[PDB]
Structure formats: C-alpha cells, structure tokens
Enzyme design. Sequence first.
Site, PDB file in Angstrom:
ATOM      1  N   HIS A  59       0.818  -1.224   0.000  1.00 18.60           N
ATOM      2  CA  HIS A  59       0.000   0.000   0.000  1.00 18.60           C
ATOM      3  C   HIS A  59       0.857   1.282   0.000  1.00 18.60           C
ATOM      4  O   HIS A  59       0.459   2.305  -0.560  1.00 18.60           O
ATOM      5  CB  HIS A  59      -1.070  -0.010   1.106  1.00 18.60           C
ATOM      6  N   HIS A  72       6.567   6.963   6.108  1.00 16.61           N
ATOM      7  CA  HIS A  72       6.015   6.602   4.817  1.00 16.61           C
ATOM      8  C   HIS A  72       5.364   7.842   4.212  1.00 16.61           C
ATOM      9  O   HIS A  72       5.286   8.909   4.848  1.00 16.61           O
ATOM     10  CB  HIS A  72       4.969   5.482   4.954  1.00 16.61           C
ATOM     11  N   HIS A 126       2.032   9.243   1.405  1.00 17.49           N
ATOM     12  CA  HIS A 126       0.817   9.029   0.616  1.00 17.49           C
ATOM     13  C   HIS A 126       0.945   9.982  -0.578  1.00 17.49           C
ATOM     14  O   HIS A 126       1.365  11.126  -0.399  1.00 17.49           O
ATOM     15  CB  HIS A 126      -0.429   9.368   1.440  1.00 17.49           C
ATOM     16  N   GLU A 141      -3.213  13.649   2.461  1.00 16.28           N
ATOM     17  CA  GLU A 141      -4.341  13.163   3.243  1.00 16.28           C
ATOM     18  C   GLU A 141      -5.029  14.341   3.939  1.00 16.28           C
ATOM     19  O   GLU A 141      -6.229  14.603   3.722  1.00 16.28           O
ATOM     20  CB  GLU A 141      -3.869  12.084   4.210  1.00 16.28           C
ATOM     21  N   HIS A 170       4.433  11.068   6.548  1.00 11.00           N
ATOM     22  CA  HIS A 170       4.081  10.717   7.912  1.00 11.00           C
ATOM     23  C   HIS A 170       5.259  10.038   8.603  1.00 11.00           C
ATOM     24  O   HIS A 170       5.714   8.959   8.201  1.00 11.00           O
ATOM     25  CB  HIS A 170       2.847   9.794   7.938  1.00 11.00           C
ATOM     26  N   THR A 226      -4.281   6.579   9.373  1.00 16.36           N
ATOM     27  CA  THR A 226      -5.141   6.782   8.208  1.00 16.36           C
ATOM     28  C   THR A 226      -5.241   5.539   7.333  1.00 16.36           C
ATOM     29  O   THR A 226      -5.869   5.564   6.268  1.00 16.36           O
ATOM     30  CB  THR A 226      -4.680   7.981   7.379  1.00 16.36           C
TER      31      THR A 226
HETATM   32  C1  LIG Z   1       3.784   2.639  13.452  1.00 17.01           C
HETATM   33  O1  LIG Z   1       3.640   1.923  12.349  1.00 17.01           O
HETATM   34  C2  LIG Z   1       4.329   0.779  12.243  1.00 17.01           C
HETATM   35  C3  LIG Z   1       4.710   0.086  13.344  1.00 17.01           C
HETATM   36  C4  LIG Z   1       5.367  -1.108  13.233  1.00 17.01           C
HETATM   37  O2  LIG Z   1       5.711  -1.803  14.307  1.00 17.01           O
HETATM   38  C5  LIG Z   1       5.678  -1.662  12.050  1.00 17.01           C
HETATM   39  C6  LIG Z   1       6.397  -2.879  11.995  1.00 17.01           C
HETATM   40  C7  LIG Z   1       6.658  -3.734  10.876  1.00 17.01           C
HETATM   41  C8  LIG Z   1       6.587  -3.633   9.460  1.00 17.01           C
HETATM   42  O3  LIG Z   1       5.941  -2.807   8.814  1.00 17.01           O
HETATM   43  O4  LIG Z   1       7.057  -4.534   8.830  1.00 17.01           O
HETATM   44  C9  LIG Z   1       5.313  -0.952  10.938  1.00 17.01           C
HETATM   45  C10 LIG Z   1       4.639   0.246  10.995  1.00 17.01           C
HETATM   46  C11 LIG Z   1       4.303   0.867   9.639  1.00 17.01           C
HETATM   47  O5  LIG Z   1       4.882  -0.054   8.865  1.00 17.01           O
HETATM   48  C12 LIG Z   1       2.771   1.080   9.198  1.00 17.01           C
HETATM   49  C13 LIG Z   1       2.313   0.535   7.804  1.00 17.01           C
HETATM   50  C14 LIG Z   1       0.851  -0.053   7.839  1.00 17.01           C
HETATM   51  C15 LIG Z   1       2.373   1.608   6.697  1.00 17.01           C
HETATM   52 HG   LIG Z   2      -1.019  -3.147   2.499  1.00 24.89          HG
HETATM   53 ZN   LIG Z   3       0.333   7.782   6.697  1.00 19.07          ZN
END
Ligand SMILES: COc1cc(O)c(/C=C\C(=O)O)cc1[C@@H](O)CC(C)C
Ligand SMILES: [Hg+2]
Ligand SMILES: [Zn+2]
Length: 256
Positions: free
Chosen positions: A61, A91, A93, A103, A116, A195
């Site tokens: 994503h 990351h 968006h 966003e 973010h 989000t």
């Molecule tokens: C605080 O967010 C996080 C906290 C986390 O502990 C991890 C951990 C593992 C991994 O992604 O492999 C990732 C994230 C992010 O990877 C969010 C992702 C759904 C864009």
């Molecule tokens: Hg995903």
């Molecule tokens: Zn985000």
Amino acid sequence: HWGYGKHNGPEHWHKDFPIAKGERQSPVDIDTHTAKYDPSLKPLSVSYDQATSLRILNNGHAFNVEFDDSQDKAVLKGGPLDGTYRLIQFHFHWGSLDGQGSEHTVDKKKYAAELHLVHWNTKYGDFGKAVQQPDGLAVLGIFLKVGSAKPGLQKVVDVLDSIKTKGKSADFTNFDPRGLLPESLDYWTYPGSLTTPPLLECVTWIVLKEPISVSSEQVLKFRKLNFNGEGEPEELMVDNWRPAQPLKNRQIKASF
Ligand SMILES: COc1cc(O)c(/C=C\C(=O)O)cc1[C@@H](O)CC(C)C
Ligand SMILES: [Hg+2]
Ligand SMILES: [Zn+2]
Ligand SMILES: [Hg+2]
C-alpha cells in the site's frame, strides 16, 4: 483485503474496521480560519540526529522506511506532546497527478503528497502497547509540493527500483530524516487516528504548515511503484491516500 481501489478503498473500510466511522478519524481538512493559536503549546522538539534507519519495505500500500527504536534515538517531544515519542517508521501518501495525494488538506487544498513520520509514546514500552492508548502515537505530517528537488529525499527515490512490488524490502541504513524537514516548524495539531486500517484512534497529529518541495522526477518515481506482488498484473502504486473525514467538533490548534 483493504486497498485504495473501487472495490476495497476508503468507502469500504468501515465493514472490517467499524472505527472508520469513529469520533477521531484522520485525515481532516484544516480550516485555517477556524484553527486557533494556542499560547500554551511548548516549542516542538524534533531530535533526529542519532536516528538509525534499518530498511525499506513495499508493504503493498506504501513503502515504510523503518528505524531501530529499541533505544531513545530519534525522538519527538514538546508541542502538544507530553513525554517522549520514539520514531519507528516513515512513509508517504501520494497521487496519480500533482493536484492530489495529501491526506490532510489546508482550506480544502490538496498537496501532491504527504509524509508521515510515526512515533510511539515511550511510557507504554512498545509500539503494540502504545496503539491501545489514546495518547500512544504522535505523527509528524509534512506536505509535499512539486517544484525544486529535495536533496534529502534522493536516497529514498533511488532505492525504489529495488522494492517495486509488494513484499520486497532493501537494506536502508544510515538514512537521515532531518533531510526531509522544512525550514519552519509551525504546525497545526489535533487528536486523530492512523489513516490506514485498522485506523486506530491513538494519534496526536502534528501537521507542519510549510511544505517541502520535491521535483517532478522524484514524485514520478514514487508512481512507478506497484501495489501488486512480483509477477502479478501491474497495478501502479498511486492515490494511496484516504480523503478528509468529519472533524466531529475536535479542535485544531495552531502553534503560530
Ligand atoms: C507505526 O507503524 C508501524 C509500526 C510497526 O511496528 C511496524 C512494523 C513492521 C513492518 O511494517 O514490517 C510498521 C509500521 C508501519 O509499517 C505502518 C504501515 C501499515 C504503513
Ligand atoms: Hg497493504
Ligand atoms: Zn500515513
Ligand atoms: Hg488508541
């Protein structure tokens, strides 16, 4: 499973994640004429000098640049925050075109992208425990507009080739997130959520007023990423943003 397309996008998320219709969902439109200067906000402290990036992951994503958070290194404090929040990942968006991608919006204005930087409250011991608390997370939100290249972003940009498809990762050590910050730290702040599903309402949002500029060439490389896994039909990773959600009389505060 959830995505951003017609059949699994933001309008669908509520079915698996009922909190999608909750009381403190993100993102939101920032009405600059309703947001109030808050004299009680302490200065924001962004300490990214000892930050340790580990790797970069296409998660189907977006892409996450992940940090070693097993020690107090890269930390956010001050502003509306109490105590110390540890950087865990960042990351973005972004859109299919420069006129959409962010966003959060400012007086309904959409930026080309949004960064973010995700931090968790150290009083809760780990990320997983933090996301069970109303003050477990702080996210630094930074708008991207298209103009001049952002030099501090180029290391991310050049590695994207290696992580084209869902589930690919690459070693991404020694990345300095200070290179992604705008000059000013003026911000808006409100209580909100992550989000993406599970859309947990754990976040103190800190959204910077000043956008960074990235080049067209830089955003275009973001857009060559894939939602799909290796050897599946190509679905370009674009428009991975959730639209603005009802404010539900929360209050957005200005630091300026
Ligand atoms: C605080 O967010 C996080 C906290 C986390 O502990 C991890 C951990 C593992 C991994 O992604 O492999 C990732 C994230 C992010 O990877 C969010 C992702 C759904 C864009
Ligand atoms: Hg995903
Ligand atoms: Zn985000
Ligand atoms: Hg929460």
